[PDB]
Paper text:
The N-terminal truncated HSP90 (MC-HSP90, residues 293–732) containing the middle segment and carboxy-terminal domain was crystallized in three different forms, C2221, P21 and R32. For the C2221 and P21 crystals, obtained under similar conditions, the protein solution was pre-incubated with cis-dichloro(ethylenediamine)platinum(II) (cis-DEP) and cisplatin, respectively, before crystallization setup. All crystal structures were determined by molecular replacement (MR) method, but only the C2221 and P21 crystals were refined to 3.0 Å and 3.05 Å resolutions, respectively, with three and six molecules of MC-HSP90 per asymmetric unit. The refined models of MC-HSP90 in the two different space groups of C2221 and P21 contain nine independent polypeptide chains in total. The P21 crystal has three open-form MC-HSP90 dimers in an asymmetric unit, which assemble into a triangular bipyramid architecture being arranged in a right-handed fashion around a pseudo 3-fold axis. Based on the observed 3D structure of MC-HSP90 determined in the P21 crystal, the sedimentation coefficient values of MC-HSP90 at dimer and each oligomer states were calculated by using the computer program HYDROPRO, and compared with the experimental values from the sedimentation velocity experiments. The atomic models of monomer, dimer, tetramer and hexamer yielded sedimentation coefficients of 3.7S, 5.7S, 8.8S and 11.9S, respectively. These HYDROPRO predicted S values for MC-HSP90 dimer, tetramer and hexamer models were similar to the experimental results. The agreement between the calculated and experimental values confirms the existance of MC-HSP90 in these oligomeric states.
Heat shock protein 90 (HSP90) is an ATPase-dependent chaperone and the molecular chaperone functions as a dimer. The conserved HSP90 structure consists of three domains: an N-terminal (N) domain that contains the co-chaperone binding motif and an ATP and drug binding site that binds the natural compounds geldanamycin and radicicol; a middle (M) domain that is responsible for binding to co-chaperone and client proteins; and a C-terminal (C) domain that contains a dimerization motif, a second drug-binding site, and a conserved MEEVD pentapeptide at the C-terminus, which is recognized by the co-chaperone HSP70/HSP90 organizing protein (Hop). In this study, we determined the crystal structure of a human HSP90 that contains the M and C domains (MC-HSP90) in a hexameric assembly. The structure reveals a hexameric assembly with triangular bipyramid geometry, in which the building block is a dimer.
Author numbering:
A (entry chain D): 297 to 349, 360 to 394, 407 to 552, 556 to 613, 631 to 698
B (entry chain F): 297 to 349, 358 to 395, 408 to 552, 557 to 614, 630 to 698
C (entry chain E): 297 to 348, 358 to 394, 408 to 611, 631 to 697
D (entry chain A): 297 to 349, 360 to 393, 407 to 611, 631 to 698
E (entry chain B): 297 to 349, 358 to 394, 408 to 611, 631 to 698
The structure:
Amino acid sequence: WTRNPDDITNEEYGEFYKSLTNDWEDHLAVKHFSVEGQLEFRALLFVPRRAPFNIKLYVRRVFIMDNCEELIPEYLNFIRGVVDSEDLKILKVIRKNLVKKCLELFTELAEDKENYKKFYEQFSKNIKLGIHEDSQNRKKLSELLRYYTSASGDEMVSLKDYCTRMKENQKHIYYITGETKDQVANSAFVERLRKHGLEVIYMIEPIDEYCVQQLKEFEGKTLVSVTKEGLELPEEKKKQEEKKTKFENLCKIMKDILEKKVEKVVVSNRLVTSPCCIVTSTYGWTANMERIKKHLEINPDHSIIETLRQKAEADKNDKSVKDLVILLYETALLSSGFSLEDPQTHANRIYRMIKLGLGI
Amino acid sequence: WTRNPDDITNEEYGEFYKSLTNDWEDHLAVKHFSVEGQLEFRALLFVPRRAPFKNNIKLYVRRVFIMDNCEELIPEYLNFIRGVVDSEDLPILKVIRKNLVKKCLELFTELAEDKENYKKFYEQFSKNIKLGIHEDSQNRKKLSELLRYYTSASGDEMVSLKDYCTRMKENQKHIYYITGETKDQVANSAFVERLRKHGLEVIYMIEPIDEYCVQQLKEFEGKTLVSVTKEGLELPEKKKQEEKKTKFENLCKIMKDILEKKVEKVVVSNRLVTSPCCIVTSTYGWTANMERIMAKKHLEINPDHSIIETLRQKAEADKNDKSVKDLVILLYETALLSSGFSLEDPQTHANRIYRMIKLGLGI
Amino acid sequence: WTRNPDDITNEEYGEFYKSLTNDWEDHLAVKHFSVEGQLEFRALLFVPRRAPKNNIKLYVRRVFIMDNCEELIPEYLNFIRGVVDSEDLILKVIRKNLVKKCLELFTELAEDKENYKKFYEQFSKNIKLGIHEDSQNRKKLSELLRYYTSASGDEMVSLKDYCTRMKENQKHIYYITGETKDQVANSAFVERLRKHGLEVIYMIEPIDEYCVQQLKEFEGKTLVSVTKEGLELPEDEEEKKKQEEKKTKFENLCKIMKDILEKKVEKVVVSNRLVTSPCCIVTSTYGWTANMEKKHLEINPDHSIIETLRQKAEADKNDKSVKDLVILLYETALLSSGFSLEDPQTHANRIYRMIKLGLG
Amino acid sequence: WTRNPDDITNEEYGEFYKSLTNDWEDHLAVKHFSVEGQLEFRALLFVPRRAPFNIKLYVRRVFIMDNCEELIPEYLNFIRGVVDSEDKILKVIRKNLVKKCLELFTELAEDKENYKKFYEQFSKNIKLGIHEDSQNRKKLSELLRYYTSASGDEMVSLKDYCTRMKENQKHIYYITGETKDQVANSAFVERLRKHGLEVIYMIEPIDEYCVQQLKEFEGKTLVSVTKEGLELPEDEEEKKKQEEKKTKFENLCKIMKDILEKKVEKVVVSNRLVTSPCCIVTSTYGWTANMEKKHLEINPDHSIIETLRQKAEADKNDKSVKDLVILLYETALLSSGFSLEDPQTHANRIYRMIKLGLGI
Amino acid sequence: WTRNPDDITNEEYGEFYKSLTNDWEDHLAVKHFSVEGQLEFRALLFVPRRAPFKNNIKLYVRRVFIMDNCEELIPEYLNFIRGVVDSEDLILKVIRKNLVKKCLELFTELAEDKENYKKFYEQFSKNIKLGIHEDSQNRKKLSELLRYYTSASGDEMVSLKDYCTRMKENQKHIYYITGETKDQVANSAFVERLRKHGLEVIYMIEPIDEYCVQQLKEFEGKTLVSVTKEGLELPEDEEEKKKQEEKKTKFENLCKIMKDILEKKVEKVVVSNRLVTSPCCIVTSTYGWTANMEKKHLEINPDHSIIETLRQKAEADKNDKSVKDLVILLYETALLSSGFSLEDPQTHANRIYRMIKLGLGI
């Protein structure tokens, strides 16, 4: 019966919401609507203030059911409220309208720039889960997403904003996943993008890994991970092509040294200060997902790499060159969020180096 | 507490009800009583305003809660009742059920005395009274009095079986009913023509449960209910009839032979006026209506009808005629549709129809 | 053990099968394979002789894990019984191999026409259910369909077979759906096509309705229901001009019948699929056919009833007999075409009147 | 967040308790504390007014679990409330909740009037806890309250039982049985009562169960008065009186043991009888009369037993002496709360005794 | 297969039985039948050798498996039956009716083998009795299967049919007593006079019996009557209701005196027609709770010395203290004897001690 009129007050909605759910605080938002034509039903739906750790079904004002899956998808299982149908699985249509209507509410929630943070803080996970599952609403959900970026400082921003700041000739949305904003932001992988004023999205939640599988483009701009092989930057490929064949020798030398530990050793287009890093194949598991393969990129303009090619052009079968190459690889792994096959040998390799720094 | 005093206000009862059942509206009716001697217990029972859909009466023993659901505390047909039972003894709850049932029936009867507002109760719970007629053998008579039906004499009102009996003719020994899908379906059905013509009142049972309910409702005030869609309909001048039976006796045998194993007998009707014939079913088999919710059929013929009068003249004078064969089967087939059965093979029925049109046209 | 060997007698497979399923007879078919590389597993799968969510047992390193793994085999292949034994703790890759191999097995069965009857009798339902659900396989599946037709008599044929026998002026595959082969082979709908030796596929399973939705064409030819409005058939010029003289000859009668029939029917058109029947009811291009778990009256220009009706109607368009007779044609045509009557009792009273007319 | 303030009116506490439990009346008691340091958490706990025929857990105001089988020990499962925490290691929360409940119960006890309300409903649990909770056994036993032979209609504590003990009284005497009237008037408590030695009347079933772990109270052992060898304060050489009587009836005892064959294990001169001629006590371990083995103590100062001594010695084989001994035995069984292995025989025996008392 | 031939050997049925149910031993009996007309189905039903502790008949349609646990197919009391039903078409209330018909047919055929019926009856008598309670329709056919020890029967269990054959000319009732054991019921106060006169009493000595005789009201039109309820009717109308009518009014005084002393503890005190050697007993009301089940009349023996001399003592002053103590004692021991419990044993004891003091000096 409250489900039945309109211009109910906020306090009235609150009370119904509270008695319905045993919540001690009132609803964060409400969406209250009816449908006409084929099916006729009214829905009253609440967004709770806190994320959980169902909706009641009526036919003509008589209670039918509590737990009814099929009514609303799992990624929207936080929604509480009532659905009162007029009739007697075609309620698949009810599901389609409820999902239309929540999404509308979320969009409405998103227009209040200042207070969306409340909803988003709590339910970003569910939006993300939905991107994965709800193929038909992947676009409209993608517009609800918000991320920290290398341009965004302390604010989380929309992919729409990201696109506004895109360069003339930027075809790709760049992102990185990891544990913390600071870990990814100081990561080797973003050094060069970040130097040239390219914006990288910092995806720092575990779902994020799961979600980017499915989020393949936004506004016709494809997302690419700055931790996978073959980074496309937006002329000066001649500058690049020269460095590639300059270090082709050293690449072939390091690859043979590392044998089965990497698939390739290439010349980087993504490093500034770090000498090298470990990127992964486009289709394999990432370093961030391996918790629960590998190319090694070298920085042509780094001085450790620069003197390594000298040392390795003149004599490849050296004991020091081998040991120096492995060490780079090993530390690069650690740095790219991988774990060592055997840390004790890595340790001993470091003590050898330490001794060479110290006399005898 | 609330289950414990008296001269509680309606508002108090309502708030209690609402909390007990998470209903948004208060109760339609309330019965709050107590029992001495044998067992000691108090009961507060509510009738909701709207029917639901494992009973729902909370059992307490000395103000402490024991059970939410307790089969045996009240029969299934009364399961819409919501309320509390508080016993003082309890470790023989047949004693509780009997008093619970006694008191509801009483409440219902008081409801029935308020003519205007009985409709509210009845609209919602007549299903349950009818179910009880089927189940509760001991209270079958009392439940029968709470029943209400549309009749051929009642127009737009539902009337009681008591009112029905008040208007029975002098020599009428039977209450007549028909079961069907809607009010208009049964009222214009073949089976009430003659009864209706002679001002005999027919109860129109138009809900599915009615079929289940009349299995057990055999009489009311010592008058037996008889369905008007069954064989051997007895009416309240029998020699007028007996002439007509022996006159059309011949035709019946020729028709039955043409119809072979589709009908058991072909008989002369006592129930038709404007219709040439109908399909009545044996006293013991499933009704026609009880198949719309998914034998044996008799075909009754109308002695007074023109079609039958001149199909007799056609069948004395030669019984092997092809068109007489065709005419008999087509009466039988349409008689089936009419009586709410289904055609075994529709395609052949249509070709049968088209053949008879080719004839009513000259071709 | 049994899932490891491979020169294993049919008796040994049958024995395993019965103990696995508590069936009393052996299997109809067996498929026993292994898979290398990506994932390492063995499957041994059985087709039961009688048609009975899924019941494939999952083993890891000869240790029993699960009995009901919903992800292992698609819903439409749930009659498959047997075991998957793996070498390591995704399932999409297993599923992929299970459906590949079943389908392979099914095609091997299809080779032996004698034995494929036994299979298809029991599981054709599932092959159709699959055309509906599993689209990556729809094409392989549709080659396994077999239907009775108007030229197959007592054996079921495939669509490939149906296409070879087509006239090459014929663009469409014809089908009718209904309850029983006898019901459909005799319907007004197939009269003219059957006289022309044009082949109609008889589709006498409830699922066929479900399935023809998805099976929109075969080998570039579109399937057309013979129950639906506007049926196109080989239109020789000698003929399709004959169809226009009749068309206009009964132009007035069609209008007069539409008028009498008011809201019960959408158009009264002159027919092109009737030989001996005076008329039939066709449904609209989309929107429920007669098969229920939109309306056109087509009249037959060469049927004496229709020929006479034209004369009586064009003599006096408001004859109460003409009206009555038209509604009787309509009603009986509803009955033919698989519909129920909105008021049986009125149809009866109409029939009594027609009887009275052909008698005095 | 009612579980947060602490200027809370009882009205507000009650309103919360009712919404939490759907009870009609408010709480009997409320304990509402917080914990600082190790783990941080707040608890709001209620003692309902009527025993049932549990605890909601929130973490940082988020509902996690309604039923958590570790939060509170099983005997305290009547406590209704919420625990809200900062994060099995619920061990530590448990500990605290049981500490604070006992703290509260102790406080309820100090308010003599109202504790009776509490102890009526929950004594059962308190005893159930005596059985299970060894760490809190002593503290729980201080809550216990019993009818005694010196308490009237009032129930009294064990601490109060002890203040009235003679200091030569070593033991705390108890009797378990069905009703107060029944135990108070039993033959077992006759002489203790006469001496003014206090007997605890335990009349609940659980009491049998509880005394199995409640062995002492303030270093004073609990003896059942229903068991063999009762020890009571033996004034100087009153025990030398009890040794004359002992040898006086040494012979009678031997005879009755013979007569009683295997029904009874010993016949002894009682030290617990004033007016009853005899009684059946059970052995130190082995089922008491509360069966949900046997000695027969005779009263050396009862006229029946004194006469029996004379008849029995004059002639140990008299059938009247036999019949009289069996009858004494049987009626003593009935008194002591056992059943007769053959009532119809005992009946017949009585009929002979009646024919004797009358002369036929 | 197995459920479609016939002249299948026993070893075959046995093998099928074992595999179907995981029993180590083969079936005690088997019933394999088929049905036409309404529905068509075949049924293969086994009686196990041992009683177990939902039913389990496997339901097949056209030889494919459908359902293990299928209630409604066979009534609860017949849930020991294991086996298979293969229906040709699928109002399975019909199937149930035939299943039950054919089980009873099998039981009757078992009962025809006097010596070996014991094997079945030992295990399943409970289930038969449960049926008598539940299956109103088959109550008669089921009653024909029951067997009981009777006062006539010594060490054998007899049918009610045989009971009826031995009835005296003028005996209108079948007499029963229910109790814990044969020796207890057989030597009870309540059967003395019936037994003296050659009237057969059925000894019902299992708890289900109490439950069973509620519904088992007659047999061969002869009504069953408990010997522990008020108003026992004997056939003795040998013009000797006058004999009985004498004693009735002869002890009318003593009866009313005893009733006043016994106050609310008995409904009435009457002169008995069922005692020989006992002085009195406690019968219960025709409608209340029996004794054997955890309103009382006190019947008194008009021919017993104790009761003969108490009538003297009662007329010679009713108000006497010892008369009061003696009446309560008879009542009390009568209670224990008739299988009730004493409300307060300590006072019964103290009463006994007083009387013992009389017997002795004191």
